[PDB]
Amino acid sequence: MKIEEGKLVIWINGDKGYNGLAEVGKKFEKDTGIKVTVEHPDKLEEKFPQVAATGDGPDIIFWAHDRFGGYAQSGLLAEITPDKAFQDKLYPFTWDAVRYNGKLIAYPIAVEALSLIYNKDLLPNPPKTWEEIPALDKELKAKGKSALMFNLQEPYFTWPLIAADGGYAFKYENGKYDIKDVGVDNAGAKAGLTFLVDLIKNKHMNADTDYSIAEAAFNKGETAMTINGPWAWSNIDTSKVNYGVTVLPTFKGQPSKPFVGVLSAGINAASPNKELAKEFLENYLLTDEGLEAVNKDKPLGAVALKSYEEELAKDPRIAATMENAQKGEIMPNIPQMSAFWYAVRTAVINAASGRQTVDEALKDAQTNSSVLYVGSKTKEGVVHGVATVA
């Protein structure tokens, strides 16, 4: 087989606590002799389905739940078999996130949402509104700093602002998402993206800023604010910055609405190690000690495991995560999410760079948002012979 029998290969995004996860893997190996190798490939959410479609890849894939319906529909995921006693250990909300066509398709790990992160020494009183950011930036620029830097390459980070005044992905009614009813080019979405583009045109932000650039600037103390998730807190702890984590600014008086993700672990349908993967996930990772090892590396957010309590008091950063999560919406897990995200990525990048107007960018994204992975689609070469055209 392509996937090696008798070991586990696990893929997780490079922003998460892969070192802590590897520690859990080493404990599994110490107890059972089964080697666990953790990797963090680039473009994971795309690499996984490409390799899994050919029966290759990791035994276990970690990503937010929104990608998993597409993976399931394409036959890339094993059926998971947690018993009732195991299911009882995790919050019902988190199982809901990984339920697709009635089946649980992955193990939920933790709830993630973006928050506003700010430097208390530069900015003891962070802005309550998006609208006050230009004036704040002007003052900071005179002091050799800037107001705000965050990743402008992934639409996840701009979505909270696009959604604030009325943008939405897929309409949800009567227990169903309507894939023909998209909210990407409505008045609310246009208002939010226009605000973002104005920030860039007015030199308060730079369209080229990505995750690494924003993190480096915030953690060096060059910018007063950033927008990020729980995984980012570890590096800020290491930094010299005295930081707060708080509610995102409002726009037109309405809350920013981050899309809430549940980090989840799926088992590759091609894996010959499905029972090993179940043992590892249920009995090693989704335990107080397992989650602690990952969380101590990079924070997970609000974990799915009911029993977990490694602190004496609440973590105010988690409280802020939850406040933002409650203001936002849970991502759909439907297969159409990949098309939505590709479309909105294009719109934000093109509007931010000036390649298109906001109206044109969102018009296209609306059209483009409204099975995914099979060998004969995902293979990089041709599958028919040239002779066929004769």
Ligand SMILES: OC[C@H]1O[C@H](O[C@H]2[C@H](O)[C@@H](O)[C@@H](O)O[C@@H]2CO)[C@H](O)[C@@H](O)[C@@H]1O
């Ligand atoms: O930007 C589109 C992207 O958004 C989400 O990905 C997040 C992920 O959920 C977070 O955990 C964070 O760590 O990384 C990503 C942002 O760069 C969706 O989950 C993903 O499918 C989508 O492509």
